């Protein structure tokens, strides 16, 4: 009925493991989800990670130009390896930061989209998940493709995701299938911020 203030961050894998066709599908998914979630008091922020980290837009930048598709469409793929834990650290320290437009008292939600296991990262999940919990970041994770077929591999999604992991993890077989979880992700976020 009424939507409370939420600072919603996306952290998207830009590893060379993602072919250009699939990077474009991820960009369309982030664009569409941000359009569907856009409510009066909602700000968005986007970081791409590989072995490098790019802030495409802060919450303050989104407040100044609240047009998700215009902000996401021009993004170029970083390529390289998959430093998912350092990505989560930079989201918590850099995006959820008053100086970058994050708001006191808003919900803090992160959506991670990963195509593969963490590799090359000097940080473990044990170095970054406690701080994300301390800062109150609700983490949804989307594991795309065959990387996430095995139980061992799904444990990494459970490690990223907020508890209970079954309510915060999505797995899709490929990037074209990202559209199939748009409604579920929207309804979970609206259940957090919606006050009847
Ligand atoms: Cl990698």
UniProtKB/Swiss-Prot annotation:
Tissue: Predominantly expressed in monocytes and granulocytes. Expressed in neutrophils (at protein level).
Glycosylation sites per record: 97
Compartments, record wording: Cell membrane; Membrane raft
Domain VWFA: 7-185
Associated disorder: Systemic lupus erythematosus 6: A chronic, relapsing, inflammatory, and often febrile multisystemic disorder of connective tissue, characterized principally by involvement of the skin, joints, kidneys and serosal membranes. It is of unknown etiology, but is thought to represent a failure of the regulatory mechanisms of the autoimmune system. The disease is marked by a wide range of system dysfunctions, an elevated erythrocyte sedimentation rate, and the formation of LE cells in the blood or bone marrow.
Domain observations: The integrin I-domain (insert) is a VWFA domain. Integrins with I-domains do not undergo protease cleavage.
Role, per record: Integrin ITGAM/ITGB2 is implicated in various adhesive interactions of monocytes, macrophages and granulocytes as well as in mediating the uptake of complement-coated particles and pathogens. It is identical with CR-3, the receptor for the iC3b fragment of the third complement component. It probably recognizes the R-G-D peptide in C3b. Integrin ITGAM/ITGB2 is also a receptor for fibrinogen, factor X and ICAM1. It recognizes P1 and P2 peptides of fibrinogen gamma chain. Regulates neutrophil migration.
Family membership noted in the UniProt record: Belongs to the integrin alpha chain family.
Record note on quaternary structure: Heterodimer of an alpha and a beta subunit. ITGAM associates with ITGB2. Found in a complex with CD177 and ITGB2/CD18. Interacts with JAM3. Interacts with THBD. Interacts with complement factor H/CFH; this interaction mediates adhesion of neutrophils to pathogens leading to pathogen clearance. Interacts with TMEM268; this interaction inhibits ITGAM degradation via the endosome-lysosome pathway.
Name listed for the protein in its UniProt record: Integrin alpha-M
Source species of the chain: Homo sapiens
Gene name as annotated: ITGAM
Range within the parent protein: 149 to 337 of 1152
């Amino acid at each position: 009925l009424y939507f409370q203030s939420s600072d919603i961050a996306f952290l998207i894998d830009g590893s060379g493991s993602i072919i250009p066709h699939d990077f474009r599908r991820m960009k369309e998914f982030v664009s569409t989800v941000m359009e569907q979630l856009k409510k009066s008091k909602s700000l968005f922020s986007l970081m791409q990670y590989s072995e490098e980290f790019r802030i495409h837009f802060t919450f303050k930048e989104f407040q100044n130009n609240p047009n998700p598709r215009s902000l996401v469409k021009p993004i170029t793929q970083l390529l390289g390896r998959t430093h998912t834990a350092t990505g989560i650290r930079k989201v918590v320290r850099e995006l959820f930061n008053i100086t970058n437009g994050a708001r006191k008292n808003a919900f803090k939600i992160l959506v991670v989209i990963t195509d593969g296991e963490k590799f090359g990262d000097p940080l473990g999940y044990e170095d970054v998940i406690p701080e994300a919990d301390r800062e109150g970041v609700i983490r949804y994770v989307i594991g795309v493709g065959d990387a996430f077929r095995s139980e061992k591999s799904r444990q990494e999604l459970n490690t990223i995701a907020s508890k209970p992991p079954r309510d915060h993890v999505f797995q899709v077989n490929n990037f074209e299938a990202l559209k199939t979880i748009q409604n579920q992700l929207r309804e979970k976020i609206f259940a957090i911020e919606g006050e009847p």
